[PDB]
Design a protein around this ligand. Structure first.
Ligand SMILES: *[C@@H]1O[C@H](CO)[C@@H](O[C@@H]2O[C@H](CO)[C@@H](O[C@@H]3O[C@H](CO[C@H]4O[C@H](CO)[C@@H](O)[C@H](O)[C@@H]4O)[C@@H](O)[C@H](O[C@H]4O[C@H](CO)[C@@H](O)[C@H](O)[C@@H]4O)[C@@H]3O)[C@H](O)[C@H]2NC(C)=O)[C@H](O)[C@H]1NC(C)=O
Ligand SMILES: *[C@@H]1O[C@H](CO)[C@@H](O[C@@H]2O[C@H](CO)[C@@H](O[C@@H]3O[C@H](CO)[C@@H](O)[C@H](O[C@H]4O[C@H](CO)[C@@H](O)[C@H](O)[C@@H]4O)[C@@H]3O)[C@H](O)[C@H]2NC(C)=O)[C@H](O)[C@H]1NC(C)=O
Ligand SMILES: *[C@@H]1O[C@H](CO)[C@@H](O[C@@H]2O[C@H](CO)[C@@H](O[C@@H]3O[C@H](CO[C@H]4O[C@H](CO)[C@@H](O)[C@H](O)[C@@H]4O)[C@@H](O)[C@H](O)[C@@H]3O)[C@H](O)[C@H]2NC(C)=O)[C@H](O)[C@H]1NC(C)=O
Ligand SMILES: *[C@@H]1O[C@H](CO)[C@@H](O[C@@H]2O[C@H](CO)[C@@H](O[C@@H]3O[C@H](CO[C@H]4O[C@H](CO)[C@@H](O)[C@H](O)[C@@H]4O)[C@@H](O)[C@H](O)[C@@H]3O)[C@H](O)[C@H]2NC(C)=O)[C@H](O)[C@H]1NC(C)=O
Ligand SMILES: *[C@@H]1O[C@H](CO)[C@@H](O[C@@H]2O[C@H](CO)[C@@H](O)[C@H](O)[C@H]2NC(C)=O)[C@H](O)[C@H]1NC(C)=O
Ligand SMILES: *[C@@H]1O[C@H](CO)[C@@H](O[C@@H]2O[C@H](CO)[C@@H](O)[C@H](O)[C@H]2NC(C)=O)[C@H](O)[C@H]1NC(C)=O
Ligand SMILES: Cc1cc(-c2ccnc3cc(Cl)ccc23)ccc1O
Ligand SMILES: Cc1cc(-c2ccnc3cc(Cl)ccc23)ccc1O
Ligand SMILES: *[C@@H]1O[C@H](CO)[C@@H](O)[C@H](O)[C@H]1NC(C)=O
Ligand SMILES: *[C@@H]1O[C@H](CO)[C@@H](O)[C@H](O)[C@H]1NC(C)=O
Ligand SMILES: *[C@@H]1O[C@H](CO)[C@@H](O)[C@H](O)[C@H]1NC(C)=O
Ligand SMILES: *[C@@H]1O[C@H](CO)[C@@H](O)[C@H](O)[C@H]1NC(C)=O
Lengths: 743, 738
């Protein structure tokens, strides 16, 4: 049972996770099998060559973010002793120089987020084995350095280096004498404004070059941002990329480009991905000679090139876009225009493999929707934040938004259409005319107040994942959404009436009509009364999310009206009743929770009482989540009540005592969470296939009655007890603040 | 006193004290007993023995309630009895004839018997709303023939939210205000409102309602049928000021209805079907004295027409003060469409909210000589780039001011919140009247403020830009509005770790109030101070002072140091663990009021308050403070209001109150006191101790006596000043012991 680290198997070797653990030195209590040690995000101040003796087998050390709340003192030669150290991470250590005397065995080295202004032969030219060197965020609006000093030739002895990052450093010019072995060179945000024919000569293996953020489009710029003198673009020579025949990824985002020279791409037959955002390329997009040089481009990003001051009627697409045969995905966010006609997109209609058109953030008023019918492979039409009306971390892509445009779970069903954040205030009769067969539709946040009658989706009848969240939809009618007989996922989260005065009544009869509806999300609808029918009914449904509603009212109704709301959900396995303000649940109401349940969530309510006997009604229940409540006690024999429960979550409650023979002999129960409660000790009498037990944030009384518990922690090494550091003695005050393991 | 808080009359507040019976510990004086929101179950005639000079009793919201025969009869000076939310089956028998106002709202009273109320001849104001509705039970409210005709001094009768089906016969001529909203009447005969010549207000709303997209359950009349109202219904109603026909599903309005009614002042037609009537509008000629007209939410379902068709007969509305046209829904507003309103000499509010209007020929608001309030929220104006629940509430009318008073007070106010102005167009404000108060809130507006955008309306004094994505890192930003006094930039952030440059503030000659809450400000470029000689209030909540002041090179020790006229600073929600001692001392010594609440403060240097000689109010709530001096007097003598709610203070000196003198309000609620010392015990007027784990034996009784000794020092919420230890005591009020 490791301390303070969490050791464990990783593939075919053993790993010590020792982070966010307030340590002030390296531990010497580390397992002897460990080959990779993460000590990051801690209060460690000094490293000497003593700090990692008896761990010669180490391969990977991470000392990132040390310390938290001067710098990190690394005594020269501190690691030379580690003959198998391949990867060494030293980010955010406030270093003032590359550590002296680093071990030749290294292959990956990160020195990001330091105050290293000097790249010497003294520091790195001895590491002939480096593949991956990362030096970014080292001189970035640091008043000293005025400029990064790159000792000449420092890099040429690195004859096996494949990755060099120097982004967010003031370099003014490209370092000379870079090794032939490079495949990826990152020079983003380096105030490199001119690029010569010499700069990238002898890099015949380059697959990636990043020159983004030089001559920034510093307008609309979140961060500190010095645009070049005038409005000037980065200046890239005519033959700058001539010997770069392997280039696959080129990023020229935010280089203020107005024109694009087609000659840059004459010897680049494999360019796969080209980022051109935050530039001024509206003219170029209309003509675009360079589009003829890119038959293999798979991703083009031209987002946010809009002209300041302008909201022009139409977009203008070069016919040359048709010369983009390999194109998978086009990103045109924030060009900004009013009307999209069938004709404007003719070039793209032939491109065989085009699956993503991203047209977010253009404030487009009208789209001639029939155009999308002419694409044999659209999977993702993304029109968020437009104005359609009704019809009648330094390791992150800094400039191109990387997360999925549309949730996987939605997109997975088929064609995806995202009309979130438009002006669709009611669903017009012609709203979805001429649309291809949409499987996944997003109307979220349209101030949309439709009274659903079963006729509004008929033109796209096969939607399977509908997201309607954050509108004002009236689904009082029991015919509502029935025209979509294949619907599998409906999200009504955050739907209210166009007033948010309380008191709104709901009719939920439409639910029963669906024959393969699987997941329904009624969260935050502030549901306190159902009118006429008082039960939910569906043979299909599997998941119901009832969070953020007033079950509290519903279930204390004088007349027992809703004692059976969720019983007629006959196949349900997952029910979330969190955030419903519950103090006490009517024993009758709980016994009508449908017995098909596997996962019940009642967390974040105000329960003082929970009747454990009722879990006999639930022979297939595996996960009970009761966190964030006020409960005071537990049954003294849980095994009696259920023998199917695997996971029980009691963190953030008021429980002070663990009953005798409680854990004995539930057996069923693998994971039990008791953290953040009021336990002071754990009795000899309370002392199973339990494989994890959470106890952090409980005020303990060490010493001495606690000793029982300890020898239990030693004879049961199988019972993993996470987060030991945060299992803290409350008292006596001489122990206070210690782990209960310190003794 | 206990348990009532008691203060030409005398009011005992016994609201919300979890009382289970009418206290007998009630000062004989008391003429107003408020017992609402409690656990009271029975009211016998024992309950108000020797409380014989009571004027008013509230018993609302208890807890149904078992009130005995003639239980209130004893009380000869009782005028006002409120009995709302008491689950009563029937009106109480034996109510005192002295009553002048009764309320029986939210009960189960399905029968209006003479037995119950006909002997209450001094009644002036009767309320029986919300009793029979949405329940089986009763099928209909049984109202005894002639029950009201003996209440000849009755002025207001409210039966709203009951099922009546027809208006009650035999109503007393003295009625001035009859309320019949949501009562299920669908026809109004000539005879129903007969002889009621003193009526100033009639409410018939929710009768044949416009149900579809109504919040609460709602039932349109069979078919699409409106309420049917005889031609003459209102013939002998010449005195009416208020007519409420909201949600009556009206298509056609009979101008004859208003022949005899030349003083109607407020007409409400929200939630009807009157797009046709707004167009023709014969009834509009019968309203010379009308001041507030409301045609809101009459949109035709399906439709989103180009234009709004406004009858010329709108110009026969010479007394109109405020017109409400929300939810009409139309794409474009032409200058020509609002001609009829341009000669109305006293029109000051046009309300066009929630119409989804794409365009507005703005120059049209120049031909109106009294417009103070143009409210255009939730429309779709775009950047311009070209030259030329509670019973007693109003269900259908938006009661609250359309624009914050503080803004409108400066003059002509334009609200364009929740529109589509993503950047400020070059001609955005051309052809506007001289505008003092502007709301541009919630427009996804990403404009780069360069000091030229606002020049067409340069006399703006109040400007609201909250919930946008503005860039004001240029020092010229907004400086074209030299008369600017209030500027709100709360919840502005970059669209996607953003620098801020806050030099623009300094340029303003006359800027009173700057709000930058929730701007996640962690760094300032170039200049590290904020400078101004005008600014009186800065709000800096929801920013990252914690970063700026844990700054390794001390660049921000004097951020606010230069706001020389500052009296109110708000550093709430700044995640401040610690304040650097000197940085604290560099807060404008002009301060009257300092808020450092809802941070994470473990220590607070109580000495640095000698430096703040004007300080009246200090707010430290919701932190982690472990202790306090002990000698507050030494450190300041101006402090009137100290707020310590929600800290970890376990000791209370003991040199506190001996002597601070200056202090009028000390708030120690939700701390960790176990007791108040004997050494711990000259004027102060409110003390807040509830929420502490008090140790209830056998001291402190000294505090118990010190409460008796010092009666002046009001302590609120006694009932929640709770013994944590030891059960027995656990859960009792410290005033109960011996
Ligand atoms: C309305 O309510 C619905 C239904 O609850 C919500 O939609 C669900 O949202 C949840 C989370 O909010 C989703 O659950 C997550 O699915 C992710 C995708 O999993 C894929 O890969 C995994 C692993 O390889 C497979 O098991 C899986 O089948 C998928 O192939 C997971 O990445 C998430 O992981 C969770 O656990 C891990 C630990 O294992 C943690 O790191 C995470 O924190 C996390 O909890 C998770 O399981 C679910 O997929 C959604 N379903 C649907 C149908 O959309 C909506 O969010 C809600 N609406 C609103 C407005 O809130
Ligand atoms: C200019 O464009 C180029 C692309 O042409 C772009 O380069 C990309 O940089 C990102 C960010 O560094 C890389 O993505 C990472 O790849 C590394 C190695 O595979 C991973 O370590 C990263 O994963 C970490 O972070 C992830 C979340 O971001 C986590 O999932 C995970 O836990 C990791 O901790 C991440 O996957 C990417 O490899 C390159 N692209 C290529 C082809 O090499 C560059 O960023 C752009 N420049 C700027 C300033 O935007
Ligand atoms: C139909 O339209 C009618 C036209 O207004 C609505 O009648 C109004 O109903 C509301 C809700 O109950 C009443 O609100 C009450 O007003 C009185 C006011 O008393 C005085 O004191 C205040 C103090 O400042 C002052 O502002 C006023 O001018 C008064 O002189 C209060 O006792 C209540 O707290 C509450 O504010 C309106 O008073 C009433 N108007 C009139 C003229 O009687 C009616 O609500 C509409 N129907 C529906 C269903 O909404
Ligand atoms: C950004 O910061 C602004 C400045 O703090 C916020 O504006 C202030 O908002 C508060 C409420 O948060 C207002 O204070 C209230 O005003 C009312 C009005 O009282 C009336 O009667 C009193 C009698 O003394 C008179 O003095 C007033 O002038 C009014 O006639 C009070 O009744 C309340 O109790 C309370 O004091 C401020 O007035 C208001 N200031 C301004 C300039 O508007 C603003 O809300 C913040 N913005 C955001 C988005 O959070
Ligand atoms: C529908 O569109 C909305 C609006 O963009 C998406 O909501 C975002 O969801 C992501 C990931 O779930 C959140 O981190 C953001 O907070 C949301 N943004 C906003 C503005 O609310 C939503 O995910 C979309 N639905 C689907 C199925 O993809
Ligand atoms: C500008 O318009 C916004 C949007 O309507 C107003 O925001 C409201 O502010 C009040 C009180 O501060 C809140 O109770 C409401 O919830 C807000 N509404 C919304 C939709 O956010 C704001 O009051 C307006 N500003 C001025 C100066 O009048
Ligand atoms: C992507 C995007 C672009 C713009 C925008 C469009 C046109 N002209 C501008 C001028 C200025 Cl000074 C600032 C922004 C704009 C506004 C909002 C937005 O979300
Ligand atoms: C004022 C307002 C009006 C509308 C609206 C307009 C036109 N036709 C409709 C048809 C239906 Cl079923 C529902 C709503 C409408 C929607 C939202 C809103 O706030
Ligand atoms: C399109 O995708 C297929 C499947 O991967 C690929 O084999 C094909 O070569 C691609 N077509 C073009 C024109 O690049
Ligand atoms: C219920 O859904 C579960 C999936 O959770 C599935 O295994 C079972 O077949 C379904 N049965 C019915 C009748 O829907
Ligand atoms: C707990 O449930 C059992 C039925 O399993 C019932 O007899 C008992 O009344 C319940 N306990 C409480 C306190 O309601
Ligand atoms: C400072 O504020 C006070 C108090 O409102 C005001 O009287 C004075 O005129 C202000 N100073 C300036 C320079 O405007």
């Amino acid at each position: 049972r490791s301390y303070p680290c969490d050791e464990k198997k990783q593939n075919d070797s053993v790993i010590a996770e020792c982070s966010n653990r307030r340590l002030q030195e390296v531990p010497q209590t580390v397992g002897k099998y460990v080959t990779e040690l993460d000590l990051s995000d801690n209060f460690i101040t000094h490293i000497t060559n003593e700090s990692f003796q008896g761990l010669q087998n180490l391969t990977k050390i991470n000392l990132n973010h040390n310390p938290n709340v001067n710098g990190l003192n690394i005594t020269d030669g501190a690691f030379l002793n580690l003959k198998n150290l391949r990867e060494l991470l030293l980010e955010d250590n406030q270093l003032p120089q590359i550590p002296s005397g680093l071990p030749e065995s290294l292959t990956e080295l990160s020195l990001i987020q330091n105050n290293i202004y000097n790249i010497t032969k003294e520091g790195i030219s001895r590491l002939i084995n480096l593949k991956n060197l990362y030096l970014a965020w080292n001189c970035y609006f640091n008043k000293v350095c005025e400029k990064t000093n790159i000792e000449d030739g420092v890099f040429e002895t690195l004859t096996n280096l494949e990755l060099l990052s120097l982004s967010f450093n003031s370099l003014s010019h490209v370092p000379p004498k870079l090794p032939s072995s490079l495949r990826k060179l990152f020079l983003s945000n380096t105030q490199i404004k001119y690029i010569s024919e010499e700069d990238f000569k002898g890099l015949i293996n380059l697959t990636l070059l990043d020159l983004s953020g030089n001559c920034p489009r510093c307008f609309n710029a979140p961060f500190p941002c010095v645009p070049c003198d005038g409005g000037a673009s980065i200046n890239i020579d005519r033959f700058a990329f001539q010997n770069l025949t392997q280039l696959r990824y080129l990023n020229l985002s935010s280089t203020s480009l107005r024109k694009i020279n087609a000659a840059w791409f004459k010897n680049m037959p494999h360019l796969k991905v080209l980022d051109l955002e935050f530039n001024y390329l509206v003219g170029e997009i209309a003509s675009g000679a360079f589009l003829t040089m890119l038959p293999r481009l798979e991703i083009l990003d031209l987002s946010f090139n809009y002209i300041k001051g302008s909201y022009p009627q139409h977009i203008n697409i070069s016919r040359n876009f048709s010369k983009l045969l390999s194109l998978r995905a086009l990103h045109l966010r924030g060009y900004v225009f009013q009307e999209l006609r069938e004709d404007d997109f003719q070039p793209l209609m032939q491109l065989p493999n085009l699956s993503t058109i991203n047209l977010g953030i253009n404030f487009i008023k009208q789209i001639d929707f029939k155009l999308f019918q002419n694409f044999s492979n659209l999977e993702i039409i993304y029109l968020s934040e437009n104005r359609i009306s009704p019809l009648v971390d330094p390791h992150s892509n800094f400039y191109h938004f990387t997360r999925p445009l549309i949730k996987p779970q939605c997109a997975a069903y088929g064609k995806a259409l995202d009309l979130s954040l438009n002006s669709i205030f009611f669903i017009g009769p012609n709203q979805f005319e001429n649309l291809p067969d949409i499987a996944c539709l997003n109307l979220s946040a349209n101030s949309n107040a439709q009274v659903l009658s079963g006729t509004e989706f008929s033109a796209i009848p096969h939607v399977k994942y509908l997201d309607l969240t954050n509108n004002r939809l009236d689904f009082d009618n029991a015919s509502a959404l029935t025209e979509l007989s294949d619907l599998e996922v409906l999200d009504l989260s955050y739907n209210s009436h166009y007033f948010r005065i309380a008191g709104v009544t709901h009719h939920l009869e439409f639910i029963q009509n669906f024959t393969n509806l699987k997941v329904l999300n009624l969260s935050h609808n502030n549901i306190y009364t159902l009118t006429d029918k008082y039960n939910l009914e569906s043979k299909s449904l599997v998941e119901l999310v009832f969070s953020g509603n007033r079950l509290d009212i519903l279930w204390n109704d004088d007349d027992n009206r809703y004692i059976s709301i969720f019983k007629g959900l006959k196949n349900l396995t997952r029910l979330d009743l969190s955030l419903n303000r519950l103090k006490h649940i009517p024993n009758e109401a709980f016994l009508n929770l449908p017995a098909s349940l596997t996962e019940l969530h009642i967390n974040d309510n105000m329960l003082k009482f929970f009747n454990w006997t009722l879990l006999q009604q639930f022979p297939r229940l595996e996960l009970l989540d009761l966190r964030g409540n006020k409960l005071l006690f537990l049954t003294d024999s849980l095994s009696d009540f259920t023998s199917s429960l695997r996971t029980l979550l009691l963190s953030h409650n008021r429980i002070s005592h663990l009953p005798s023979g409680f854990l004995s002999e539930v057996s069923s129960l693998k994971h039990l969470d008791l953290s953040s409660n009021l336990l002071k000790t754990i009795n000899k009498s309370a002392l199973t296939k339990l494989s994890m037990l959470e106890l952090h944030g409980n005020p303990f009384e060490c010493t001495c009655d606690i000793g029982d518990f300890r020898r239990w922690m030693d004879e049961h090494l199988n019972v993993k007890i996470p987060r030991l550091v945060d299992v803290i003695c409350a008292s006596p005050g001489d122990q206070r603040g210690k782990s209960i393991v310190s003794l």
